[PDB]
Amino acid sequence: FFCVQGXANRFXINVC
């Protein structure tokens, strides 16, 4: 449930 930007992540895409 980790979303840096509207769910952009691109690195954690989960929790990072």
Side-chain angles (χ1 to χ4, degrees):
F1 294 97
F2 169 36
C3 259
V4 278
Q5 308 295 321
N9 251 347
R10 254 74 176 271
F11 42 77
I13 309 75
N14 289 129
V15 266
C16 334

